[PDB]
Write a protein that binds this ligand. Sequence first.
Ligand SMILES: [Zn+2]
Length: 193
Amino acid sequence: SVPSQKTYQGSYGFRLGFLHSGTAKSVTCTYSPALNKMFCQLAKTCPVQLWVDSTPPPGTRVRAMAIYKQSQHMTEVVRRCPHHERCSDSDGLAPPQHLIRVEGNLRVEYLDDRNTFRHSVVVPYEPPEVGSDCTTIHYNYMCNSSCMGGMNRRPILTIITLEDSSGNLLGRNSFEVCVCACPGRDRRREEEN
Ligand SMILES: [Zn+2]
């Protein structure tokens, strides 16, 4: 019933990478390789890189979806808290309830699953930019992890899926995410164990 989170590289050798951003006070987004966990700020650019060994055809799509990490909460749909959804932060594309947005891509598509009610955001796959070995997507997380009513400090996974134009699954990967005021300090803190 719960969406699969099993890693699969598949035919194209698909995996994720992240900027090596460090943990200074001013970083807005920082990834910990030890924890496989992203720490980022509400509404700020969160670059996720897509790495492939061979190029997928045009038509290929890239989906992102959040699920709760813990088993007791896994079947609960991850959505925004009431204070955040019912606030004028819309971009005219994203449904107000969706945690994950994509910025700087007018081909963005949002889905409420007709059967699971789960939210996801999908953008066209595009090959790497000139002078770059990966494809970057800028995600936005629109709720703090601390938001009472929403996640309420409960840890979440973001699952990134590569799909062909006909919806066939090509590859999958995932990472944990914390949305917080001081990503840098918080990453340092959580690695201390
Ligand atoms: Zn919130």
